[PDB]
Amino acid sequence: SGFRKMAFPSGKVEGCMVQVTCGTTTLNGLWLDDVVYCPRHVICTSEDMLNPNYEDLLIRKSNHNFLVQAGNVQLRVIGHSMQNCVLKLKVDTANPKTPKYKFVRIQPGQTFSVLACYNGSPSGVYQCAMRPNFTIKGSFLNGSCGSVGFNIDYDCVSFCYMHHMELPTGVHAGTDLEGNFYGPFVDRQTAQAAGTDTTITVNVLAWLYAAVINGDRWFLNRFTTTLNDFNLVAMKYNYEPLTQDHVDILGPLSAQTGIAVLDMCASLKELLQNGMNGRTILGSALLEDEFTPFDVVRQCSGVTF
């Protein structure tokens, strides 16, 4: 029993984290097989970050300008190329601790674990959601660039995020492992607007199923409602609209608790209109949206790695 913001065990990712230095810029890299992946702005001075020309900065650089450390082990760079916002450094040594992995681009609402690192060394692990405006509400300091986000399916590590920037509003922006930014962001220090954030409705519903599973049932009401009626209300409160895809994904939780999705929808409807009245659900006085339906199943059924 109980319910926590649970992260994946980080061990398989810890053995991939390295330190990358170019000139006086140091940040984190990911060592898989004989390639080290890192943010391309490693080739920038702090000055360059205002208006960087990544082309002309990169031409002025050779293989030996790049220092790669895995612990006290020096890796030798024998090749370098820029793929969108990521640098790939080919090194002389394949990482003997390379796990089974894949590169995935996640969708808004999906969750992942972040291994926050400084100078190639792990500091902490926490679970995050990709917000609908493509930011993450992380915990990152100077030198955390190159930290990664991941999911584990069985023995396979799915890398979905590399950390690049803090925006002037103190939220976080980065790329997939192919170096394409999530959202409309660029790797330049200039004012950048994230769009309005919205609540990930399907995740809030997943969390209400989790509450019922854990004995918190007070919010369960007499009423029902329709998708269309539910969605009119959701859009007033800055909730994401609910699709047939969301209803299909909540099927297993529906079947476990004996509560039809639309019934859970009516319950949520009342909470938006009337609030929680200074009651709590699973020890929180707000509606939580950083658990997927898969996270709830994983935690309440005991899935291992």
Active site amino acids: 41, 145
Dist. CA 269–CA 231, nearest whole Å: 9
d(CA 180, CA 271): 38
Least distance CB 218 / a copy of itself (angstroms): 16
Nearer to ligand R8H, 26 or 199 (CB): 26
Per DSSP, the three-state class of 268 is: helix
CA-to-CA distance for 274 and 178, rounded, in angstroms? Answer: 45
3-state class (DSSP) for residue 104: coil
Which residues of this protein are in contact with a copy of itself, per CB under 8 A?
1-12, 14-15, 115-119, 121-126, 128, 137-144, 166, 170-172, 214-215, 275, 278, 280, 283-286, 298-305
Residue type at 155? Answer: D
Choice between 144 and 201, CB closer to ligand R8H: 144
Q: Give the nearest distance from C-beta 143 to ligand R8H in angstroms.
A: 5
Rg (CA), the chain: 22
Among a copy of itself, ligand R8H, none, what binds residue 161 when CB lies within 5 to 8 Å by partner kind? none
Q: What is the DSSP letter of 96?
A: T
Pair type for strands 17-22 and 25-32:
antiparallel
Which residues sit directly before a break in the chain (C to N > 2.5 Å)?
none
Nearer to ligand R8H, 117 or 287 (CB): 117
**Cβ atoms within 10 Å of 187's Cβ, excluding its own:** 22
* Nearer of residues 42 and 115 to a copy of itself, judged by Cβ: 115
Beta-strand pair 156-166/172-175: antiparallel
Min CB(180)–a copy of itself separation in Å: 23
Comparison of 122 and 241: residue with beta carbon closer to a copy of itself:
122
Give the H or E element holding residue 66: strand 66-70
Query: Given the rule CB under 6 A, which residues bind ligand R8H?
Result: 1, 25-27, 39, 41, 46, 140-145, 163-166
157 closest CA partner among 134, 177, 183, 185: 177
Side-chain half-sphere exposure of 80, counting CA atoms within 13 A: 21
Report in angstroms how near the CB of residue 217 gets to ligand R8H at its nearest.
19
Sign of CA dihedral 182, 193, 41, 28: negative
CB neighbour burial string for 79-90, b if at least 16 within 10 angstroms, e if fewer = ebeeeebbbebe
Smallest gap from residue 291 Cβ to a copy of itself (A): 12
- Find where tokens 């190159």 sit: 146
User: Minimum distance between the CB of residue 234 and ligand R8H, rounded to whole angstroms?
Assistant: 32
State the binding partner of 96 from ligand R8H, a copy of itself, none, CB within 5 to 8 A by kind.
none
Which entry of ligand R8H, a copy of itself, none binds 230, CB below 5 to 8 A by partner kind?
none
Three-state secondary-structure class, residue 205: helix
Residue closer to ligand R8H, measured from CB, 147 or 292: 147
